[PDB]
Amino acid sequence: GEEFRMEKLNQLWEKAQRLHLPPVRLAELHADLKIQERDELAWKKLKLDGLDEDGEKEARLIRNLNVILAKYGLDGKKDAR
């Protein structure tokens, strides 16, 4: 809504719920999502300003995403399944 004014986070948030997950996981996930939310928003302005063109900030995000993927396993058809 007012906090999540981006469908990118909205669809991902509900996806986890549709896969059925406990509140303890949803809480951590929601927190983790907030870290990515603000990061992407900041990176967007940064890119326009010309702060990150090599893709260092995003590379850092990917590394963190690896932790998230190995923690919540929210991928789909990465190659075969």
Binding site: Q11, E14, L41, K44, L48, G76, K77
Partner: protein, 82 residues
């Protein structure tokens, strides 16, 4: 000065410069604040390259990737997307 950028592009908040195709697309830039919805009034989100996500939502038409069927009951994939 004008500070509005050529017609092929557009000027972000403080009279910056961003390509026209960045306004109403799916990415949050900063035309007004993020030039998303609160700019073009969002006529069916974007009738350029759009696909319909979860029960009638609007996502990038090129979100297929895996070559299968995306959103419908669940999201497109959220795997090979980003």
């Amino acid at each position: 000065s004008a500070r509005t950028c050529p017609p092929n592009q557009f000027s972000c908040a403080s009279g910056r410069c961003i390509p026209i195709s960045w306004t109403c697309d799916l990415d949050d830039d900063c035309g007004d604040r993020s030039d998303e919805s609160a700019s073009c009034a969002y006529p069916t989100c974007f009738p350029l390259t759009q696909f319909t996500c979860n029960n009638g939502r609007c996502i990038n038409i090129n979100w297929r990737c895996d070559n299968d069927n995306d959103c419908g009951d669940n999201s497109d994939e959220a795997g090979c997307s980003h």
